[PDB]
């Protein structure tokens, strides 16, 4: 049926030092809140209403969705209190799903597996199994059927045997929930409203709560400082790095691989040591990737080799294209098919002819090179300049924008060119 | 006695997902199956009896061998089949061992324990013992003698409690393989000739099969997808730093170190992160290598020092040679004692004086420098081109090839050179 | 009470494979037995009492501290004759503390609680509980005290079953280790004199030894080889890496993170994988280090962003300050508010105006800029060379040092200067 998520930001990270809520910190270039909406949308969530509790400004300032429903909770009184606050946007109809914005790593599969479970009229809760649960409030089951979540501080010494624990994501009617959120407490050593209280509701009601278990303890487990968020990092890039070589993709040592967005993989593709790739990157087949480069938001064409050490952002690289080492292309960069471009060579805004080459230390601004060009080491441009097919360019040429060039030109080292240039004209 | 190797690549590696058959694919640089070749010729195998049954074009294209033997598998009837087509090149007299084409880290010195195992006119076989053996064959032994070999389907109850399984590595006498070889059926749910019933057939016979152990469980793990090749990938890296630190290699991370070929080191070499070593590198004594470099086919003399993210290709280094960082020296460079490359410098086919610098954004191509000569930021060779000893290069020179330079030159900033240069004489 | 400290390296390196003394050998920038000598003076050692048997010229040209004290051990028998050596220099009120050099990861917290449990006229000895103690001297308690310490082969079989061992670390009284020193023989199968032995004169007298534990075995851990060393070098790295993560300090990989040296962050600084940090660093709120890149006693300022593969050597970086990529900056280098330095620049001895950009291929050498500055790309100085406020330089411009530019100023495209310019005056 229908469904909405409530995602939780409401928890105060202190222990992060941060003057940035800690919701908002990156997880593979991603901010985690947004792992827990992008997942959300995969659900289907009709809305997504987001609880906060501090760092506002900034978290409308990043986070923008057509469909986020932005709820204050203006003091922390905790779970209990914050589902209150989105609870009067919860439809009857509607199944609602509690999920929380420091737990990035909470899987798709796992979420369906837990809608699925659900009892009508009743709740469906994720719960995992600790060798050691301390502290961790304890699934009581009666006959194998959950009858309520047992606090550790209020757990009996029976309770605290209990491997099965809770892991604060559950799914339920929005009728349901509206019903027992009315009827929470603060009647405790905290003062606070403890969501676990509505699964002892359910039972007494009659109705019955349901446990599915993640396939990874990963999954549930949450940031509060920065290291937990270091080790989920690890954590979701090991587990991506091992999706690709399955894939056919090979990477040479997959610890020493990043990958913070999305990969579109031909075959073949190699990748070697300390690669770390960005935004979106679409790779053909049979492309190399040297050691230690760099690839944002770009498009590499079948059978490139990107020799080590180069950073591409924003650049569409066509079939057969080499660069590197020591290359870098500035966004909007364009290689044609067959074209090099050579160490301590920088490219913006430009294009590079079919089996044009700028083999050393040579800037190109705002220009636009035609096939079987030649580009001298040390060509500059001072930025637009444009050059036609078959064009030679000598050692430490400076053209100065605008400055056209024909077809065939052939020109002299140490040259400077402020005028255009003639077909098939020599110039020094 | 003599021996030969018959190397199995039947196996058709489709969870690899590549156009390149299975076995070239590469771990630290070479291929596994190359890997297979190179402990054959060690242990001295007069033949190389390699069975394929897919990609024969790419197979002989990519590996040569004097000795060896390409056996065509028309159909993959399993190992019992393959080693069939090799039976007939079999000499009687010659033991004859099994190996893997994606068993590429089997171990030389594990392969002569083996070769003395055997008894005569019986089996040596390679068995290992795994705390969880599932799906692998069992060794069974009466009275402590090998009896023979169980498929894990076959297997009664009793059985799966085995903890020794079958590599698939075993030596006979040539002319015992033909006769067992001969005896195989396929009357059996895959309808395959499984090798594993020759064991049999020797205890049968009232010969004798004895088991050794590899000394790693590495050593006789086999690949079928990227993921398995990256792990044995990173256990032979970790393997070879191991060597290296304990031979007085100092690796300052040895998970960052990536060893594809053969190092010959001095004493008291220091090797930083992330380091790439390539082909067949030789340092001298008390050589520094920067984080991130990379070298290829290429001798560094003692005393250097390569700075950081420097890369170096089939160059030849003298004693006291400094490079980088940012440095880069193409094929055919070479350095003479003493001599200095600055960042975001190239050389091609060039040699640097003794005592001689080019510290800045300098390319040099088909040159050759003298001792004590300074090279101007900026400097570049439309390459050949000669320098005496002694000359000064001004800034952003630039140098057409060809054009000698006398020795004592002096030469102008902004200088564009055509024509030589007498002895002693300031050009501007 | 006061205290010294005794530092044994006469332990002579063999293993290690070099002329260099084995407690010299680096660990995270600083030669082992630095640490020790660091940790020494934390504690407020009056005297450090450094015990060497070889590599005398290479110890004293390594270290220099004012309180050093060197001992010669002529001949190498035993820790027992090292203390005896170093004993005529102790006092009779001071504690003596007995460190080793090979021992680099000792805590000074840990020594600290050593030194409390010292009951007087008696031993505080450093022991730790293994899984599996073997040829470890093992700790001999009757009734819960300590009576002596046995060395693994005089081990009988009970006591080869205590987990409790002798890491070599004690406290005791200055005039009580004379008293004991005294008394030690080297009647035994090698000829040495252990000091293990005092051990049992203390309980023989009457006098006590209290044990106290390290928080971990790294602590205790000395190395005899590379191999090793590179151990405890990644345990020294990854320590450091989670206190400054908990610490607000986000790493994106932490194993990919070395620090050599002393770090002061501010708030909010995230660096990313294969950062290796040197010396003395200094880095402002939200400071960001591109992947690779390499500080030493440098000071980066509030919100500066150094982008990937930069290398930077005692520069001083004010706020808002942008490099890289591939930015190299040697010593001497400053950069003024807002200012940029792109790819392919180097900086010596340099200062850059405020927002003043050298985006390309440009070396500065000795050199001034003024605020609003522009670079061209391709600039070069054969250094000083002094620019005023609001120049701009043509692409692949040269100034010849003393060359001094007006404020102002305009310079055209492969201009070349050896003169002054007047201000505000264009020049070609």
Redesign the interface.
């Known amino acids: 049926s229908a469904m909405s998520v409530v995602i939780l930001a409401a928890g105060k990270g202190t222990?992060?030092?941060?003057?940035?809520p800690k919701v908002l910190?990156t997880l593979a270039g991603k901010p985690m809140v947004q792992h827990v909406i992008d997942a959300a949308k995969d659900l289907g969530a009709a809305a997504v209403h987001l609880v906060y509790g501090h760092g506002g400004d900034l978290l409308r300032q990043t986070l923008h969705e057509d469909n986020l429903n932005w709820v204050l909770q203006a003091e922390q009184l905790g779970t209990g209190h914050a589902m209150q606050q989105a609870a009067p946007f919860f439809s009857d109809d509607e199944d609602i799903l509690m999920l929380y914005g420091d737990v990035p790593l909470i899987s798709v599969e796992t979420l369906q597996r837990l809608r699925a479970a659900k009892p009508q009229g009743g709740i469906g809760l994720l719960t995992v199994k600790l060798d050691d649960p301390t502290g961790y409030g304890r699934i009581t089951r009666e006959n194998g059927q959950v009858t309520g979540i047992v606090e550790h501080k209020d757990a009996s010494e029976a309770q605290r045997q209990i491997q099965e624990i809770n892991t604060g994501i559950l799914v339920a009617n929005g009728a349901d929930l509206k019903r027992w959120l009315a009827k929470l407490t603060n009647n405790n050593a905290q003062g606070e409203y403890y969501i676990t209280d509505i699964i002892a509701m359910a039972y007494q009601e009659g109705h019955e709560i349901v446990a599915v278990h993640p396939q990874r303890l990963s999954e549930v487990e949450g940031v509060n400082?920065?290291?937990q968020?270091?080790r989920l990092?690890?954590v979701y890039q090991s587990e991506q790095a091992?999706k690709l070589?399955?894939?056919?993709?090979?990477?040479?040592?997959?610890?020493?691989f990043?990958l913070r967005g999305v990969l579109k993989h031909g075959?073949?593709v190699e990748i070697?040591?300390?690669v770390?790739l960005q935004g979106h990157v679409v790779l053909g087949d049979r492309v190399k990737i040297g050691?230690?480069c760099?690839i944002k938001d770009s498009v590499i064409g079948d059978d490139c080799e990107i020799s080590?050490?180069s950073?591409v952002e924003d650049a569409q690289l066509q079939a057969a294209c080499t660069i590197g080492?020591?290359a870098?292309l500035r966004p909007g960069a364009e290689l044609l098919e067959g074209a090099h471009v050579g160490?301590?060579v920088?490219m913006k805004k430009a294009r590079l002819g079919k089996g044009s080459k700028a083999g050393?230390?040579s800037?190109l601004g705002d220009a636009e090179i035609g096939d079987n060009v030649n580009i001298?080491?040390?060509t500059?441009?001072?930025n637009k300049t444009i050059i036609g097919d078959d064009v030679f360019v000598?050692?430490?040429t400076?053209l100065?924008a605008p400055v056209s060039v024909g077809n065939g030109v052939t020109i002299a080292?140490?040259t400077?060119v402020t005028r255009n240039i003639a077909d098939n004209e020599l110039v020094l």
């Open positions: 222990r992060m030092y941060s003057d940035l910190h400082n920065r290291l968020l270091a990092e690890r091992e070589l399955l894939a056919g993709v090979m990477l040479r040592d997959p610890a020493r990043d075959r073949d070697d040591t300390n770390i050691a230690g760099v080590p050490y950073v080492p020591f870098r160490n301590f920088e050393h230390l800037y001298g080491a040390g500059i441009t001072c000598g050692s430490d400076q100065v080292a140490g400077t």
